[PDB]
DNA sequence: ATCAATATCCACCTGCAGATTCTACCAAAAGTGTATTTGGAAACTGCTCCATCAAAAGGCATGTTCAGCTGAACCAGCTGAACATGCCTTTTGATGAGCAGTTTCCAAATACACTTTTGGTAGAATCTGCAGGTGGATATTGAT
DNA sequence: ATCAATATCCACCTGCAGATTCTACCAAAAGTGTATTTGGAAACTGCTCAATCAAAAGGCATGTTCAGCTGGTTCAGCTGAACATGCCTTTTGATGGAGCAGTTTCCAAATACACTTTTGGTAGAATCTGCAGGTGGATATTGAT
């Protein structure tokens, strides 16, 4: 179910493993179940810590 | 010329992996340490794998041996059978 | 002409998928993933059931033991809903013999 | 235009982050990894052969492990008010997980 | 009067006891905010283990939690305990 | 002698380190721990009873766990060029072990 | 007059202790520790052997399987020495029937 | 054997759990085997990180 | 640097809490003999794996250049250790039912032999979503 | 704000590697019946759990000090991301051609199982001694004038 939801979100009609990883890591409980499990061809979630980006003061400064 | 073959794990590939891990900036010294760490992991796995391999009196390493050896180290793997 | 036979849970997963999202497919690799997942959970639950039985010196694995193992392994609400489905299944099976 | 267009340091790294995080293909080339596995396995037992899918499975495991390691390392680095990861960070994370070596 | 001893709860796990515990880990200097967080952490740990123990207890139709249940519940979390049977 | 003898900050902590590391007796008192366990158990199931040795076993497990956690905490602290542990260190250690909550 | 019977590994540990350090004793708690330790290692090894057997569709657990599991679970030199003792034990047992 | 050696080091003729813990953590391989095991009444090894001990310049300074 | 303070080590002394040794006896372990698997040798085959060639080709080795990073002095202030005190919690010993742990026994539960279907699966024969391609609209970036 | 250069995202197309569906069929599921075992409701019983009051032991909440730790500021290096270039390890793709995975036979070895006979492991009653505790005296580590 979660996979199909992500699938519709990316406009793809066929489930691929990427979707499964996206489903698992976005639900807390499943992530707990599979916290030490690697899904092949899965990758990880997009996530950058806020601190290492550049500051939002990137605009007119005069 | 070949270079102990660990150097096949090149700098830019490691940089790419670190990019997947959320890393933005990498020191020059990381590479050697990473290589060593990688080696250790592989060694352990393959040892166990080969042990399973030796038990069946086979000469061909199969995926299942790797999967089991991975399972026993607490890094269970999905997507290659069993 | 010699030929083997490897079983899997593929077809049942396919049925479930069509039940939940009729206009949707799934690739082979993901089907393999689901196969591995099912086998892993099966192994954990049965192993835990066995350990519970052996600790209480009972030689029969019943529905009770499975239910307990489920409450042990899975967290909270997932367990509750699952247990409810299982109880419903037992209640349907036992009646309509 | 006279001078070459030049992005500031860090931006292209971020571009690499988003690009590789969107996709899933393996990052390391097959053949060197095959040679690595073959060398190490030879030192334990001789004349071993490997199925392709086993090599792929090791590749997946290795890359997932490294990714997780770099993640914890980066957290350790941020904790020290730095942005650059260094070997002691990796040693720290590995020492905490119990992956001693 | 209002005692309810300090909360009738975890707050009986007094500060200097946590200090002694940190001393066992080799630590020298502790901040004032540590205590509460540690308590919460402790609770979570206990919660999980006790839950499992009680569940084992529930399977045998007993009203007494035995040591064995604690051992097994700890074993499933990868914190096996020796010296109390099993 | 006029003024009270006074040790410098840190020394007595070190003395406590050596004294408690050399011994093994439990540091937390039985009764509060008993009451804590009893309260939490009451919220899951009512009128339960507890054998004494079960309480002792929980005590041992908890203290060992906390000791390990403070150890990793102290390492993370040292990593940031500090000597004072802080909550974020504990959060870092627990997050790395996967003991999320 | 009713009386049960609980087995342990105590007496054997005591024998070994007197073999290695004649002028030394051991407390009850530590003997319990050793008892639990023995039980844990026994369980791990048997389970691992079982898993190997089940993976190779062999229904018999033999010395070979135990040897394999030992090499898997334990590290390095400990494995080698223990394996040596095991092989010596089998060679002695099989001869002097 | 390791326990009895530690015992002779502490001038006690009887093995107690403390000694077992000392034996286990001081052998690399046993520590690997039992890295996630808690010995009751075991305690831990004496170990203070070098950095939080005071500087050796604690003497005449004039 | 040397002197007092205090903590801690170390020699010596005593009685008791587990440590250690001695009975009976019964669940447990070895021996015969038989019934029943079962795993390794031998004979075959076809799948998969391994050493080569070649044409790109995307990627890797190297070399510049500079904007952001990593530390290293320095200092305000804060915050948490040392210590004293009184006080408050905790400890520990007074000689009833509840529940863990057995023992019976049989009504329910379930393994095992055999036959009858039948759903699952390998392989042939269709489908099609999506990997590639092409083109154009913004969206970031970055200098000015 | 305002303007050039690339990077990312939408729109529209098209053919094929992978997905889905259609056969044949053969190793599992279900039925039936019968043999075997078992879990759970009654009868007991002996260890253990539940918590109060009084008297005493030891530790903690609090409040007073003050040494040195954190953490922000500033600054001198330095070194690691961008990006150009040229060449070269890898992709792909094909082909051969050896060797091993996996089947199928089969029978000499191995082991479960039903008894029978020994036996040592373990509960429980008599000894015992190492160590907890205690007394006292000598050295070690802190720290000040």
Swiss-Prot record, chains A, H:
Residue numbers of N6-succinyllysine PTMs: 32
Keyword terms: Acetylation, Chromosome, Citrullination, DNA-binding, Hydroxylation, Isopeptide bond, Methylation, Nucleosome core, Nucleus, Phosphoprotein, Ubl conjugation
Example of a GO MF term: DNA binding
Subcellular localization: Nucleus; Chromosome
Modification note: Monoubiquitination of Lys-56 (H2AK119Ub) by RING1, TRIM37 and RNF2/RING2 complex gives a specific tag for epigenetic transcriptional repression and participates in X chromosome inactivation of female mammals. It is involved in the initiation of both imprinted and random X inactivation. Ubiquitinated H2A is enriched in inactive X chromosome chromatin. Ubiquitination of H2A functions downstream of methylation of 'Lys-27' of histone H3 (H3K27me). H2AK119Ub by RNF2/RING2 can also be induced by ultraviolet and may be involved in DNA repair. Phosphorylation at Thr-57 (H2AT120ph) by DCAF1 is present in the regulatory region of many tumor suppresor genes and down-regulates their transcription.
Modified sites of kind N6-(2-hydroxyisobutyryl)lysine: 11-12, 32, 55
Residues where N6-(beta-hydroxybutyryl)lysine is found: 32, 55
Primary localization: nucleus
Signal peptide positions (record): none
Positions of modified residues (Phosphothreonine): 57
Positions carrying N6-glutaryllysine: 32, 55-56, 62
Bridged cysteine pairs (disulfide): none
A GO cellular component entry from the record: extracellular exosome
Biological process, per Gene Ontology: chromatin organization; heterochromatin formation; negative regulation of cell population proliferation; protein localization to CENP-A containing chromatin
Superkingdom field: Eukaryota
Sites bearing N5-methylglutamine, chain numbering: 41
Modified residues (N6-crotonyllysine): 55-56, 62
Sequence position, cross-link Glycyl lysine isopeptide (Lys-Gly) (interchain with G-Cter in ubiquitin): 56
Protein family: Belongs to the histone H2A family.
Protein name listed in UniProt: Histone H2A type 1-B/E
Organism of origin: Homo sapiens
Origin organism lineage: Eukaryota, Metazoa, Chordata, Craniata, Vertebrata
From Swiss-Prot, chains C, G:
Family: Belongs to the histone H2B family.
Domain of life (superkingdom): Eukaryota
Residue numbers bearing the PolyADP-ribosyl glutamic acid modification: 7
Residue numbers bearing the Omega-N-methylarginine modification: 58, 64
N6-acetyllysine modification, residue list: 57
Cross-link Glycyl lysine isopeptide (Lys-Gly) (interchain with G-Cter in ubiquitin) placement: 6, 92
Annotated compartments: Nucleus; Chromosome
Biological classification of the source: Eukaryota, Metazoa, Chordata, Craniata, Vertebrata
Residues carrying N6-(2-hydroxyisobutyryl)lysine: 6, 15, 18, 29, 57, 80, 88, 92
Record-listed N6,N6,N6-trimethyllysine modification sites: 57
UniProt-annotated glycosylation sites, renumbered to this chain: 84
Residue positions where N6-(beta-hydroxybutyryl)lysine is found in the record: 6, 57, 88, 92
Keyword rRNA processing: no
Role: Core component of nucleosome. Nucleosomes wrap and compact DNA into chromatin, limiting DNA accessibility to the cellular machineries which require DNA as a template. Histones thereby play a central role in transcription regulation, DNA repair, DNA replication and chromosomal stability. DNA accessibility is regulated via a complex set of post-translational modifications of histones, also called histone code, and nucleosome remodeling. Has broad antibacterial activity. May contribute to the formation of the functional antimicrobial barrier of the colonic epithelium, and to the bactericidal activity of amniotic fluid.
Major subcellular location class: nucleus
Residues carrying N6-methylated lysine: 88
Modified residues (Phosphothreonine): 87
N6-glutaryllysine: modified positions: 6, 15, 18, 80, 88, 92
Modified residues (N6-succinyllysine): 6, 88, 92
Record PTM Dimethylated arginine, positions in chain: 51
N6-crotonyllysine PTM positions: 6
Residues that bear Phosphoserine: 8
Gene Ontology MF term list: DNA binding; lipopolysaccharide binding; protein heterodimerization activity; structural constituent of chromatin
Part of the whole protein covered: 30 to 126 of 126
Keywords of the record: Acetylation, ADP-ribosylation, Antibiotic, Antimicrobial, Chromosome, DNA-binding, Glycoprotein, Hydroxylation, Isopeptide bond, Methylation, Nucleosome core, Nucleus, Phosphoprotein, Ubl conjugation
Protein name: Histone H2B type 1-J
Swiss-Prot record, chains D, F:
Keyword flag DNA-binding: yes
Modified residues annotated as N6,N6,N6-trimethyllysine in this record: 2, 22, 45
GO biological process: chromatin organization; epigenetic regulation of gene expression; gene expression; nucleosome assembly; telomere organization
PTMs per UniProt: Acetylation is generally linked to gene activation. Acetylation at Lys-88 (H3K122ac) by EP300/p300 plays a central role in chromatin structure: localizes at the surface of the histone octamer and stimulates transcription, possibly by promoting nucleosome instability.
Residues recorded with modification N6-(beta-hydroxybutyryl)lysine: 22, 45, 88
Sites bearing N6-methyllysine, chain numbering: 2-3, 22, 30, 45, 88
Keyword terms: Acetylation, ADP-ribosylation, Chromosome, Citrullination, Disease variant, DNA-binding, Hydroxylation, Lipoprotein, Methylation, Nucleosome core, Nucleus, Phosphoprotein, Ubl conjugation
Tagged with keyword Cytoplasm: no
Phosphothreonine modifications at: 46, 73
PTM-bearing positions, type N6,N6-dimethyllysine: 2, 45
Modified residues (N6-lactoyllysine): 22, 45
Modified residues (Phosphoserine): 23, 52
Signal sequence coordinates: none
Listed GO CC annotations: extracellular exosome; extracellular region; membrane; nucleoplasm; nucleosome; nucleus; protein-containing complex
Modified residues (N6-succinyllysine): 22, 45, 88
Residues recorded with modification N6-crotonyllysine: 22
Modified residues (N6-(2-hydroxyisobutyryl)lysine): 2, 22, 30, 45, 88
Job of this protein: Core component of nucleosome. Nucleosomes wrap and compact DNA into chromatin, limiting DNA accessibility to the cellular machineries which require DNA as a template. Histones thereby play a central role in transcription regulation, DNA repair, DNA replication and chromosomal stability. DNA accessibility is regulated via a complex set of post-translational modifications of histones, also called histone code, and nucleosome remodeling.
Protein name: Histone H3.1
Gene name of the encoded protein: H3C1
Curated annotation (Swiss-Prot), chain E:
UniProt-annotated location(s): Nucleus; Chromosome
PTM: Acetylated as part of spermatogenesis progression prior to histone-to-protamine exchange.
DNA-binding segment(s): 1-4
Modified positions (N6-lactoyllysine) in chain numbering: 15, 61, 75
Modified residues (N6-succinyllysine): 15, 61, 63, 75
Positions carrying Phosphothreonine: 64
Annotated Gene Ontology cellular component terms: CENP-A containing nucleosome; chromosome, telomeric region; extracellular exosome; extracellular region; membrane; nucleoplasm; nucleosome; nucleus
Cross-link (Glycyl lysine isopeptide (Lys-Gly) (interchain with G-Cter in ubiquitin)): 75
Modified residues (N6-(2-hydroxyisobutyryl)lysine): 15, 28, 43, 61, 63, 75
Substitution effect: residue 75 to Q: In TEBIVANED1; results in severe early developmental defects when expressed in zebrafish embryos; results in defective cell cycle progression when expressed in zebrafish embryos
Function of the molecule: Core component of nucleosome. Nucleosomes wrap and compact DNA into chromatin, limiting DNA accessibility to the cellular machineries which require DNA as a template. Histones thereby play a central role in transcription regulation, DNA repair, DNA replication and chromosomal stability. DNA accessibility is regulated via a complex set of post-translational modifications of histones, also called histone code, and nucleosome remodeling.
Name recorded for this polypeptide: Histone H4
